[PDB]
Design a protein around this ligand. Structure first.
Ligand code: SF4
Ligand code: SF4
Ligand code: K
Ligand code: ZN
Lengths: 556, 115, 57, 88, 89, 124
């Protein structure tokens, strides 16, 4: 009819100066110019970064590369989202350029592990190699946005990988079988004969929860309790404590941020600590009457703050002055504590000061709202706390342990590892934590395993396997049970379901996939009764995969 | 058109008891041809061995319950009888039919690669 | 539809057995699946009716 | 649903037990595919770099129409499965 | 007090209950009020609370050498819960 | 010398030899792609034991036959048109904007272009 000419008009106009670059387009097989110049149209007729392969020759304009920048992201931690927004191949990804075609890539739906958000992503693989990671829509967490760290650390899994067991003979690791590796640990285990507190276990940021739970059973049957993550919590028991869920979870969850009034930043840099949520605050900060006050080390943000200072004593006058008066006035006030609090010297002062303001008012904690939340940055801390994988005595943390078994742990420079101790590292990369090792057991990349992860909001999100582990690597926990038989501490778990069967005894929420079990208003207030410098140096050197990623070498 | 040797019409039996008697005669038919299967296919196993394997075949799946799935199992077993008695399967397939076939601990499977 | 296009087993010759034997499937090159980049949009609509008017309400 | 149809489909014994089928939704219909093998799903051939495989269900996808229709099929064949609810 | 400070065998305490419903009414009450008594006196005994949607009340503690004995607390009163937890050791 | 043969480079420090059967190509030693397997490594296989290396296919490397070709120049215009330089049996026609001040290669042929003014500047 007459209407169809409109499609035949706009289609003709767009394909006027357009380059004939379809064979050489990076995303030539999925641009919404071809697929929309076929169904509706007729038939006849500078650079911005080491991340985005700009070619405005292929633009159709619409300034979506412009409208997004001044709205969501605003030297930008989120500028890579422009790649997924431009329909035509005007702005294509540089690292992925000229490597794959969409009709060949296999897609899997999984989650990020770089930060504690655990945003839903879609991974496009090719055989035994991951090509690109794209975000999959989820309004509850991310909603189409992932930081440049997540989507450009993919190639970090193609180098530095541990593919074989390694054994130290002198000062250089050698290629040794699994039979000897699982014995050299047990052989040297009884050479030094560690005592009850002479065995230590450190869990890394990327270590999954199945290994975290399954390691305790192996540790317990050998009688040890020097187990915790690779943080630097001055208080040996966690200041929030693993006792109650509400002590360390985003009781609001992500879907309860856009309806807030007052937000408190307890020593944090949300731009560098959670990019997805940082823009979420910026999106609200534009139209709403949002008020956010800065309490912590000074930094640079996409948005101004009601900045106060840099010291803890700045917060002393906050909850009692007009800074905290609006918190009382807020129908849905927000308190956020970053992962950089427990590391600080005054971590204990943080919880008592704030929870006194959460045990005072009643509008903060309603049957529909909880004003206190935590913002961790690792994907293994919350999993550790929901399973009680943390110590509860400074004396145990002071022991000069003779056998430290690392499980994904890297940030252990401030951890006093005795020189004479027996250090066994199990992981999937060669980095800081690997040098300290004596017998190395290769693990699995997060895309190569079915690992049940827990984000900073308490949501239990697992992964679906994408590729087989490289070389002769095995699953993370499967080594521990394999290691169990070599020490006389065999675990009764013989398949991945039984590992989830064990999780049933740990808690009921661990077996609810994509389902968040909250803390009830009648109990979370009891958990409140228990209580009564930016942690990150380099944005592009935070996790193991980023450090080994050739792409991030262009981000420095 | 003239149907071949050892043929039966494909009929949807609507009785529980009749199917019981049809099977029993069928099992005897296999045992009657025990000597032939050895001589026809030149099997290395003697006549008693074939009956032993046939019994292991018939004992294996005697506990089925669904009548609609009883006829299907009787129909296809008839084809197996008809194919074997008419000397249709090659020699190799019968030799490998009887030549098919305890697990291992988790450490054994972990080391080599499991599945 | 649930039967795989490559089948479950394939045969070869085993010299020790001196016969051609079935064996579980093994592919040196697996069947690449290119349906993933299929159409995400609509292709064809209702069309134009041609029903003779004698067969309508 | 109660029928042991696996004795008439002729499928190998491993499909009933050792394989897991995902019922997902890519935007109006549902699909079934089998999760990848632990090892031997894809190994690089040492001759020409071909993507070898021993999994015979890698290339199989069944296009369904309705969710309950897919679940009816999985129970009919005696298949272990799990269902992935799409995000709204 | 009395027997609140559990012996050295008790190394992990887990408290599981339903956020909603009526079945977990009593278990919430016992843990809500009596928590501070054991907590301060037993500094190194973890007090694990893991909530759920409608599951019956259930409390199981972990002994030495990685052993647990399953214990149920479905439908007890607000004071008989202490009695049931006394018998573990 | 066991160093450049297994590393990808823009050019070759040494002058290549046509008669060296360990090079990636007769006209280039180091491979021209990061993922490309060096020829010296590949020939160290079981199937090259008795097979003669002289007769194996060793086509000349592409990344050299282009850089020998002198850069084309455009006079008094800033749009370069290239369609294979062979008629209707070439690559699809592409227009090259000459605003940037260096040699911008063609999409398919790899031919490089310039302007009238920057002829002295680009050649530096
Ligand atoms: S954006 Fe689409 S239409 Fe334009 S050149 Fe690339 S593939 Fe062709
Ligand atoms: S987003 Fe793409 S199509 Fe829109 S103006 Fe930018 S380059 Fe052009
Ligand atoms: K694009
Ligand atoms: Zn050209």
């Amino acid at each position: 009819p007459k209407i169809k000419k409109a499609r035949e008009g706009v289609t003709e106009m767009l394909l006027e100066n357009h380059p004939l670059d379809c064979p050489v387009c990076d995303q030539g097989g999925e641009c919404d110019l071809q697929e929309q110049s076929l169904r509706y149209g007729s038939d006849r007729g500078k650079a911005i970064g080491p991340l985005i392969k700009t070619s405005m020759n292929r633009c159709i304009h619409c300034t979506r590369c412009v409208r997004f920048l001044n709205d969501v992201a605003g030297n930008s931690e989120l500028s890579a989202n422009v790649i997924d927004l431009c329909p035509v191949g005007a702005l294509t990804s540089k690292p992925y350029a000229f490597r794959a075609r969409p009709w060949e890539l296999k897609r899997t739906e999984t989650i990020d592990v770089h930060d504690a958000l655990g945003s839903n992503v879609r991974v496009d693989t090719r055989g035994i190699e991951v090509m690109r990671v794209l975000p999959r829509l989820n309004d509850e967490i991310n909603e189409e946005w992932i930081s440049d760290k997540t989507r450009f650390a993919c190639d970090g899994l193609k180098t530095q990988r541990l593919t074989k067991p390694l054994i130290r003979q002198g000062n250089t690791f050698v290629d040794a079988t699994w039979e000897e590796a699982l014995a050299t640990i047990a052989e040297g285990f009884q050479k030094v004969q560690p005592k009850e507190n002479e065995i230590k276990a450190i869990v890394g940021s990327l270590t999954d929860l199945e290994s975290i739970v399954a390691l305790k059973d192996l540790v317990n049957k050998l009688g040890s309790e020097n187990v915790s993550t690779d943080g630097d919590a001055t208080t040996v028991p966690p200041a929030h404590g693993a006792d109650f869920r509400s002590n360390y979870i985003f009781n609001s969850t992500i879907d309860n941020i856009e309806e807030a009034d007052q937000i408190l930043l307890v020593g944090t840099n949300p731009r560098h600590e959670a990019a997805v949520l940082n823009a979420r605050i910026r999106k609200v900060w534009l139209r709403s009457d949002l008020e956010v006050h800065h309490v912590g080390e000074e930094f640079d943000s996409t948005f101004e703050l009601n900045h106060l200072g840099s010291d803890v004593n700045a917060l002393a006058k906050a909850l009692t002055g007009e800074v905290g008066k609006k918190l009382s006035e807020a129908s849905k006030p927000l308190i956020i504590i970053g992962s950089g609090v427990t590391e600080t010297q005054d971590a204990e002062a943080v919880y008592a000061t704030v929870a006194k303001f959460v045990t005072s008012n009643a509008n903060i904690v309603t049957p529909e709202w909880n004003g206190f939340n935590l913002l961790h940055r690792e994907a293994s801390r919350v999993g550790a706390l929901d399973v009680g994988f943390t110590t509860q005595s400074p004396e145990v943390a002071n022991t000069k342990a003779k056998f430290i078994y690392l499980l994904g742990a890297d940030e252990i420079v401030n951890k006093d590892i005795p020189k004479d101790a027996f250090v066994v590292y199990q992981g999937h990369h060669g980095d800081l934590g690997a040098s300290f090792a004596d017998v190395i057991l290769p693990g699995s990349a997060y895309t190569e395993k079915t690992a049940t992860y827990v984000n900073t909001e308490g949501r239990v999100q697992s992964t679906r396997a994408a590729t087989n582990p490289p070389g002769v690597a095995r699953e993370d926990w499967m080594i521990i049970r394999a290691l169990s038989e070599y020490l006389g501490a065999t675990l009764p778990y013989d398949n991945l379901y039984e590992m989830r069967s064990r999780l049933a005894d740990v808690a009921p929420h661990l077996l609810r996939h994509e389902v968040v079990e909250p803390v009830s208003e009648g109990i979370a207030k009891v958990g409140f009764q228990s209580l009564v410098k930016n942690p990150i140096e380099n944005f592009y050197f935070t996790d193991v995969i980023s450090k080994s990623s050739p792409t991030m070498a262009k981000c420095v | 058109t003239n149907p071949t040797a050892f043929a039966q019409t494909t009929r949807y039996v609507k009785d529980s008891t009749e199917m019981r008697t049809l099977v029993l005669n069928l099992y005897r038919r296999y045992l009657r041809h025990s000597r032939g299967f050895v001589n026809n296919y030149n099997l290395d196993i003697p006549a008693s061995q074939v009956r032993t394997k046939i019994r292991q075949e018939f004992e294996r799946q005697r506990f089925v319950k669904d009548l609609p799935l009883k006829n299907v199992l009787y129909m296809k077993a008839q084809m197996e009888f008809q194919e074997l008695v008419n000397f249709w399967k090659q020699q190799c397939h019968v030799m490998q039919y009887f030549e098919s076939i305890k697990g291992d601990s988790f450490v054994q499977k972990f080391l080599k690669g499991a599945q | 539809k649930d039967f795989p296009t490559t089948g479950y087993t394939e045969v070869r010759y085993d010299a020790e057995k001196r016969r051609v034997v079935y064996e579980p499937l093994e592919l040196t090159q697996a069947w690449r699946n290119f349906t993933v980049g299929s159409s995400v949009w609509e292709q064809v609509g209702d069309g134009k009716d041609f029903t003779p008017e004698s067969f309508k309400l | 649903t109660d029928l042991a149809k696996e004795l008439v489909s002729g499928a190998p014994k491993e499909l009933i037990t050792e394989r897991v089928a995902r019922i997902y939704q890519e935007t109006e219909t549902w699909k079934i595919d089998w999760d990848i093998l632990n090892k031997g799903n894809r190994w690089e051939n040492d001759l020409m770099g071909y993507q070898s495989s021993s999994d015979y269900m890698q290339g199989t996808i069944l296009k369904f129409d309705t969710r309950e229709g897919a679940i009816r099929f999985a129970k009919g064949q005696g298949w272990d499965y799990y269902i992935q609810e799409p995000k709204v | 007090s009395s027997k609140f400070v559990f012996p050295k065998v008790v190394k992990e305490l887990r408290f599981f209950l339903s956020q909603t419903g009526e079945a977990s009414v009593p278990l919430r009450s016992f843990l809500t009020k009596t928590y501070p008594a054991i907590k301060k006196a037993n500094p190194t005994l973890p007090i694990l609370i893991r909530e759920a949607y409608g599951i019956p009340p259930s409390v199981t503690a972990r002994l030495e050498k990685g052993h647990e004995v399953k214990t149920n607390l479905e439908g007890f009163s607000a004071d008989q819960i202490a009695k049931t937890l006394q018998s573990i050791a | 010398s066991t160093k450049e043969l297994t590393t990808a480079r823009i050019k070759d420090i040494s002058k290549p030899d046509e008669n060296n059967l360990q090079q990636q190509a007769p006209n280039r030693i180091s491979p021209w792609s990061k993922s490309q397997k060096p020829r010296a490594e590949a020939q160290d296989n079981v199937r090259f034991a008795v097979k003669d290396l002289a007769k194996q296919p060793r086509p000349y490397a592409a990344i050299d036959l282009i850089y020998k070709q002198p850069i084309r120049y455009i006079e008094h215009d800033n749009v370069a048109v290239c369609d294979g330089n062979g008629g209707a049996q070439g690559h699809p026609k592409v227009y090259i904007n000459l605003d940037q001040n260096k040699a911008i290669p063609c999409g398919y042929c790899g031919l490089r272009f310039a302007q009238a003014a920057f002829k002295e500047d680009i050649e530096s």
